[PDB]
Amino acid sequence: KLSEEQQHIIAILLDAHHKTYDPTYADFRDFRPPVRMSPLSMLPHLADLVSYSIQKVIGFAKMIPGFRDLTSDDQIVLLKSSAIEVIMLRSNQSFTMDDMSWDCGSQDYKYDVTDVSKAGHTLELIEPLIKFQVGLKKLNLHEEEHVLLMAICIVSPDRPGVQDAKLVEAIQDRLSNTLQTYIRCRHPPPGSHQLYAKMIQKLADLRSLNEEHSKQYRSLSFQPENSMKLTPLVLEVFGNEI
């Protein structure tokens, strides 16, 4: 079955997530208020939401067993490229197929297609994002699998700019093996049917959502009036060629 190390890893990731993802979304009040007039009217709010989310993803990443053994540069490299992917991933917890939106406890903090479209990004990205959310949602992942996937997403040895790939790759495998064994021993069929394969497919989807996001961020942030509505962390992480 499972293992001491594996169950240990799971317990840690679950707690790490519970400490970096607030189901009350109480912090959203601190963000620049959302405006629904792209008019970019939603950019100041989502920019802060995203920046905040980057800070929480880092908080989570630091607690991933083995992530501490990577060199600062490797850590930066991994978080730099995975951030947006993990944010889309953790967002599935607030997404609902009822109205196809992210319900973050409140109406103002309820975001639908036209809300997230008012921030400089087109349907070239939003269309696939929602599809992703629905497909992911349809997997009904246990919270154990959800956190292991975010963790596996973060420590991917093929990230551009990686140094000690062997180590990054080594740390991931341990998470992957923990995931595959968890599914086999804790996820009952039919739900478990090719669950691993489907979860890894979502990782490929995220790479794709990432690339499209990068292309629409460049275009967006290449315009001063737009890049000045962002936050310093966002500029640092998402690159700053303004």
Partner: peptide, 11 residues
Amino acid sequence: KNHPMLMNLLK
């Protein structure tokens, strides 16, 4: 590679 804030949040 020039990421003080990321660096600061990471350590």
